């Protein structure tokens, strides 16, 4: 099964309403594993299975790093604002991470955003930064001049990130590697006169990845299908739905290697 490890950083200039100047959160798939902010000034585990396997002395080194990274972010956003001739509150974002796919192959990514829009995207294969505009182009040139940092990121993405991901997957196996099959139902109702609506509703499933489709006489529908988002139920499970307007219909649900058909 596909798994991912991700670290995000969010920087805000001139924050109001208790919003921290800096937040950093780590995830394994949908699950938060670590947190740091400019208020606590401390890196802490956000999952019981992280706290249970990593001694409090492990977070000591990460606290220092994050304080240093918090300072760099503040400086970088001040520089970005100057380049764009921008006043007031602006945000700077970073995402680093890797995926371990089902086939055993891997992906790595490193990107920045200014005001929630793509800014700089790392290319670990050509060892370069893709810039959206001229301000990003200026940053790109300064970063590309540092060959060492680039090779270090490629290594971290391809090697270190994967080794951490595998280690965290072992710690959180009872959560991350479990399967809770969906409970699926089909509801039929007459809506506007003549118009019949069919809804395929699934709930109580984990992992959140599910494929839900509507078919007509065993073949795919060329009519409009409505899709409900995969939503967290609040207990570690998810829910989703798919609807069609009936003019031999069946709902096809795939989840974790189990295919399920519900005919109307």
């Amino acid at each position, epitope marked *: 099964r596909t798994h991912s490890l991700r670290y995000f950083r969010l920087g805000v200039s001139d924050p109001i309403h208790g919003v921290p100047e800096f937040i950093s959160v780590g995830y394994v798939d949908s699950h938060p594993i670590t947190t740091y902010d400019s208020v606590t000034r401390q890196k802490e585990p956000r999952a019981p299975w992280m706290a249970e396997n990593l001694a409090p002395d492990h977070w000591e080194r990460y*606290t220092q790093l994050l304080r240093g990274w918090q300072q760099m972010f503040k400086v970088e956003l001040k520089r970005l604002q100057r380049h764009y001739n921008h006043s007031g509150s602006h945000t700077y974002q970073r995402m680093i991470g890797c995926e371990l796919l089902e086939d055993g192959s891997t992906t790595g990514f490193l990107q920045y955003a200014y005001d929630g829009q793509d800014f700089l995207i790392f290319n670990k294969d050509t060892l370069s930064w893709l810039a959206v505009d001229n301000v990003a182009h200026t940053i790109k040139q300064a970063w590309e001049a540092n060959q060492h940092e680039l090779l*270090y990121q490629k290594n971290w993405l391809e090697e*270190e990130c994967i080794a951490w991901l595998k280690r965290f997957l072992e710690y959180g196996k009872d959560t991350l590697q479990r399967t809770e099959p969906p409970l699926v139902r089909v509801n039929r109702k007459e809506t506007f006169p003549g118009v019949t609506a069919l809804f395929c509703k699934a709930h109580g499933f984990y992992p959140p990845e599910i494929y839900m489709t509507w078919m007509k006489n065993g073949e795919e529908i060329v009519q409009e299908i409505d899709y409900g988002d995969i939503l967290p139920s609040g207990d570690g499970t998810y829910q989703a739905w798919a609807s069609i307007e009936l003019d031999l219909y069946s709902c096809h649900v795939e989840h974790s290697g189990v295919h399920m058909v519900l005919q109307v």
Partner: antibody
Amino acid sequence: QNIDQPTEMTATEGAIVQINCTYQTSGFNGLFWYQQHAGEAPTFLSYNVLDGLEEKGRFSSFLSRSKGYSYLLLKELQMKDSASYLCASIDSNYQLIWGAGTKLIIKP
Amino acid sequence: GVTQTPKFQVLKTGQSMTLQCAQDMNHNSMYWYRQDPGMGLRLIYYSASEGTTDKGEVPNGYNVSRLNKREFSLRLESAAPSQTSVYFCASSETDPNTGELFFGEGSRLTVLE
């Protein structure tokens, strides 16, 4: 883990010397070579993180990730090359681990 | 680059000592190491950026102050003979460092009964 390098090495003036360094078995974020003359501060020579040979004048730094080792190759040895060579590596928690250093003696 | 004072010092057991270190390279990260025969440099304390400091491998008997972006002082409040050593201050642009670590000239400290 450990960073291991020979305590001392002796070679002849004009010849070639290879200083080996075996590093930590867990976590790797790069390897450095530093030069240190007797009574002086260490000075940076190189940083390696990916596989290969980086050449910088009479000095070359090699890294093998699979083999877990690095070497500092010194060519056409000079008396001025008499110094200690420090190997240092970055672990999975970005902590720098230092080797004890290899004292290099040049026979004129 | 990195200016470290003093180069030489003799202390009596119990005496206080401050080692000064300054860099004008606009570096964020500063470090204090000690060098002893037969072993690799050992980190006493470090400062990842201005406004933060933390213990290294050998913090006992020392304390530090990251006074501003430029300065990182090392204090021995009550000198002990085991503190006889060569002390190097260093700085790097950021932490983790993949570039050059810049060292001060060294401070040779002798603590005697």
